[PDB]
């Protein structure tokens, strides 16, 4: 059984609070042949390396994918401290991982582009006495809490999205407000990967 | 360099209500929470409540509640209380004045109305028939 | 509310000389959320020192404040001809904010 890259190849990424999960168990995988895809801009990794990543065996890998453009490299960083990390998407500090920057080339048709890419540029809540705010830092693994009321893509740079909370839900408010970078001529797109070490039957082809 | 900019002396009859603006110059809103204050004749200083620019909710005294509305405009930095039913007892320097600003919570919490370090010039109101 | 209550109403001391101006709340004021401004005729109030004790930008040396739970003092260690005024404490522990009655801080002769 080979682990199934393929829904990456498919169809619009989503943006990067909206960052879709593939998680592969039991499996024989070919991330080389995978990366051959793509024009692998940049490719960086924390407690392992691009040669390792490639060549051991996992308990468990896990592959995050999103629509990212490159000219916010600096945002998407095991050492960052901007919106990116701080509200749309962050990787374990504990496993190792991977985070590669690609573009994908005339060659490859079957990933289609969204109208621009959109970040969230912050999270927040307002509790219910109406005057403590608490940013809402995003967790490892996890998605912004503003995912529900943030677009599948931000329409303008700058809107506003809020919600005021039922008491069940803790009363106040969440709010978020929406960042656009403009569509490049060929889609750049961000990947996550995560790996941990158990039985580990995710092994190279 | 940070300024607020109040706009000017108004005169309303009892019953009425007025509405007064401060306009933030020489800095962003950048998030610090507005203040209203009031300060009649010879007396000392009322908090009458704020707004937070990033919700857009605004908090209001006990004592106001009902009586007065707060709000913001980002695109004109401009931030306003409208106060309502007035009486002669309203008459008062009317105050906009800008939370200190602090490192942002992203501590892991961020109190707003707090201390005020720049505030605006004042307005002056007289309620009278 | 938190009533905040000044003492004395007046101070009457010569340029040189200490001034201790006290606060005390009706009950204790979280976080030490305590500000004191100084307010001169026609002008608003200045921020002098938040959070109880630190400094607020461009105040000089001689403003300290200090205290916590429900008493507050503000010194000012030698006065200064400009530091005559009314001093307001304000705390922000609890809603709504609130401020004391006000010291006046005169000139003896």
């Known amino acids: 059984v080979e682990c199934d890259f393929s829904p990456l190849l498919s169809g619009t990424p989503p943006q990067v609070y909206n960052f879709k999960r593939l998680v592969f168990t039991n499996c024989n995988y070919n991330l080389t042949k995978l990366l051959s895809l793509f024009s692998v801009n940049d490719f960086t990794c924390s407690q392992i390396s691009p040669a390792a990543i490639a060549s051991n065996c996992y308990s468990s890998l896990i592959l995050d994918y999103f629509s990212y453009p490159l000219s916010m490299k600096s945002d998407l960083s095991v050492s960052s401290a901007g919106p990116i990390s701080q509200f749309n998407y962050k990787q374990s500090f504990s496993n190792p991982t991977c985070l590669i920057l690609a573009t994908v080339p005339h060659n490859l048709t079957t990933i289609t582009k969204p109208l621009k890419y959109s970040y969230i540029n912050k999270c927040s809540r307002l509790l219910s006495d109406d005057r403590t705010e608490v940013p809402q830092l995003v967790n490892a693994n996890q998605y912004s809490p503003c995912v529900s009321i943030v677009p599948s893509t931000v329409w303008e740079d700058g809107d506003y999205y809020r919600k005021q909370l039922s008491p069940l839900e803790g009363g106040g408010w969440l709010v978020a407000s929406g960042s656009t970078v403009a569509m490049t001529e060929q889609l750049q797109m961000g990947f996550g990967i995560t790996v941990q070490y158990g039985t580990n039957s995710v092994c190279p082809k | 360099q940070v300024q607020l900019v109040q706009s000017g002396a108004e005169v309303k009859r009892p019953g009425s209500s007025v509405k007064v603006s401060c306009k933030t110059s020489?800095?962003?809103?950048?998030?610090?929470?507005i203040n209203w204050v009031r300060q009649a004749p010879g007396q000392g200083l009322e908090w009458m409540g704020g707004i937070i620019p990033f919700f857009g909710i605004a908090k209001y005294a006990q004592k106001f509640q009902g009586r007065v509305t707060i709000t913001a405009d980002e695109s004109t930095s401009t931030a306003y209380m409208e106060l309502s039913s007035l009486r002669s007892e309203d008459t008062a320097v009317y105050y906009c004045?800008?939370?200190?600003?602090?490192?942002?919570?992203?501590?892991?919490?961020?109190?707003?109305?707090?201390?005020?370090?720049?505030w605006g010039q004042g307005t002056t109101v007289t309620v009278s028939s | 509310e938190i009533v905040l209550t000044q003492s004395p109403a007046t101070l009457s001391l010569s340029p040189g000389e200490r001034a201790t101006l006290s606060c005390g709340a009706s009950?204790?004021?979280?976080?030490?959320?305590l500000a004191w401004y100084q307010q001169k005729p026609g002008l608003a109030p200045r921020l002098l020192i938040y959070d109880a004790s630190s400094r607020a930008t461009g105040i000089p040396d001689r403003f300290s404040g200090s205290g916590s739970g429900t008493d507050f003092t503000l010194t000012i260690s030698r006065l200064e001809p400009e530091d005559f005024a009314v001093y307001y404490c304000q705390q922000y522990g609890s809603s709504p904010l609130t401020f004391g009655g006000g010291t006046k801080v005169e000139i003896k002769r």
């Open positions: 004045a800008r939370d200190l600003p602090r490192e942002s919570s992203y501590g892991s919490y961020y109190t707003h109305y707090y201390a005020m370090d720049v």
């Open positions: 020489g800095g962003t809103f950048n998030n610090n929470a």
């Open positions: 009950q204790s004021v979280s976080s030490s959320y």
